[PDB]
Design an enzyme around this catalytic site. Structure first.
Site: not given
Length: 284
Positions: A181, A215-222, A262
């Site tokens: 998390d 992912c949630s925003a599509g920039i960090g984990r992705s 991010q």
């Protein structure tokens, strides 16, 4: 400069925040006018994360062709990816329309539906074989065929049917379920294992349309997933693997979608994953 020595240098001097802010300062800025039109406000999860106009994925419909999704095209590595936000209640039908139209074989999901007590994306796939989903706005049917639950990820076989033509296709859902998390994982071993399972499936290969990753925003984990894949493929291809510059690869990818990677912790984790992954690429 060998990234591994670069890594120790940054770690001993504790300058990760400074490196990361240099990237943010040098990153591309292109217009995102379609994303910001008033008719699209309920198609965006976050007001500060938008696809550039020049690289956005267009839906094949005359109504409204907008979805928050971008095509990242890596020319030297010969890989393409579609990076998108976690679908919203009003965009689950658009999401599966895009998967169909772009001829994707795989979907990569790097978040849980609920994290930190809040919803991070819609429940957009069926959880039981006998309870299929129908998306009436885009005329698609989605059925769970099989499910394989492991300790760090789950792989699902799905059937997507275009109800207009009755064609069907098999889609593979690769779901990494154990990103914490807060922060990043302590070891990249399970993330690399997951990346190799996606690769082995064919979902990243040129016989199919681009993989969809979110992912949630599509920039960090992705962003971490595609940066590590491309860097390891370039180390495979080149005569001098130490020539691969992860900061330069990241800036190239940021020509196609804003904000990839991010935090300074995600940048460090990306280095760690590439460094450890290379100890297979060079022959083990």
């Amino acid at each position: 400069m060998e990234m591994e020595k670069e890594f120790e240098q940054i770690d001993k001097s504790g300058s990760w925040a400074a490196i990361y802010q240099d990237i943010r300062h040098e990153a591309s800025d292109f217009p995102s006018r379609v994303a910001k039109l008033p008719k699209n406000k309920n198609r965006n999860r976050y007001r500060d994360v938008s696809p550039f106009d020049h690289s956005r994925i267009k839906l094949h419909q005359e109504d409204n062709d907008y979805i928050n999704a971008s095509l990242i095209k890596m020319e030297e590595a010969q890989r393409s990816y579609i990076l998108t936000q976690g679908p919203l209640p009003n965009t689950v039908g658009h999401f599966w329309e895009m998967v169909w139209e772009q001829k994707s074989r795989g979907v990569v999901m790097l978040n849980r539906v609920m994290e930190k007590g809040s919803l991070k994306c819609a429940q957009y796939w069926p959880q039981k074989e006998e309870k299929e989903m129908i998306f009436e706005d885009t005329n698609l049917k989605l059925t769970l065929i099989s499910e394989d639950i492991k300790s760090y990820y789950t792989v699902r076989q799905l059937e997507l049917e275009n109800l207009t033509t009755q064609e069907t296709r098999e889609i593979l859902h690769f779901h990494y379920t154990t990103w914490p998390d807060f922060g990043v994982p302590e070891s990249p071993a399970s993330f690399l294992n997951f990346l190799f399972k996606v690769r082995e499936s064919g979902s990243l290969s040129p016989e199919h349309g681009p993989v969809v990753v979110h992912c949630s925003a599509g920039i960090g984990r992705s962003g971490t997933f595609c940066l590590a894949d491309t860097c390891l493929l370039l180390m495979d291809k080149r005569k001098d693997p130490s020539s691969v510059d992860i900061k330069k690869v990241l800036l190239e990818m940021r020509k196609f979608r804003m904000g990839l990677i991010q935090t300074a912790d995600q940048l460090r984790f990306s280095y760690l994953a590439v460094i450890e992954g290379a100890k297979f690429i060079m022959g083990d």
